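REQUEST
  id: r-88c1
  op: predict_structure
  target: Eukaryotic elongation factor 2 kinase
  payload:
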Amino acid sequence: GSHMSPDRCQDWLEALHWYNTALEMTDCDEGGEYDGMQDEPRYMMLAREAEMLFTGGYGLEKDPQRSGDLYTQAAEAAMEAMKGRLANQYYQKAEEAWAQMEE
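RESPONSE
  id: r-88c1
  status: 200
  body:
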């Protein structure tokens, strides 16, 4: 191969189609695919803040609600960036965030 490319363009639809109800673990197969990603990834920022809202971050109080809202937005931006694995994980984390309120 020349360079790992996001040829898994259908995988993010597939991933979100099967859903991820928090407690569903996946392969977590997120390595490094460099093709078409000519953009400054917003989903990492959104997920980083979501993480700060999840476990408590730099001046961010833990809030499962905002945490999931940020993770769901992050998943949108992730699946937008042809990265289904990230979208799935962030969605998995969004579900976990709210699941913590019913546990």
